[PDB]
Amino acid sequence: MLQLWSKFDVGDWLESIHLGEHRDRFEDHEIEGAHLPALTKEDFVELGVTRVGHRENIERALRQL
Ligand SMILES: [Cl-]
Ligand SMILES: [Zn+2]
């Protein structure tokens, strides 16, 4: 589950929701499962998620879990 995801799982998760384009950068920033729920709009910008739609997809996917 989320809290137990390593940076690679988060990467796999991004692919599963069609945002694999963002996995390398997330990985370089050492983003792990436990970090996801706390990422702000600014963290996402810094992580390369500059398209509101994609940030919304990430956010929506987090609520599903
Ligand atoms: Cl984007
Ligand atoms: Zn994107």
Structure determination method? X-ray
CA of 37 from ligand 2 middle (Å) equals: 18
Number of helices (H) and strands (E) in the chain: give both, helices first: 4, 0
Distances in whole angstroms, Cα of residue 39 to Cα of each of 19, 36: 16, 5
Closest CA to 22 of 44, 52, 3: 44
Torsion angle of alpha carbons 43, 56, 5, 25, nearest 10°? Answer: -50
For residues 60 and 44, is the Cβ–Cβ distance under 8 A? no
- CA geometry: angle at 18 spanning 14 and 26, to 5°? 30
Q: Which domains does the chain have, with CATH numbers?
A: 1-65 (1.10.150.50)
Please tell me the distance from the alpha carbon of residue 21 to that of residue 13, in angstroms, as a whole number.
Answer: 12
43 C-alpha to ligand 1 centroid (Å)? 13
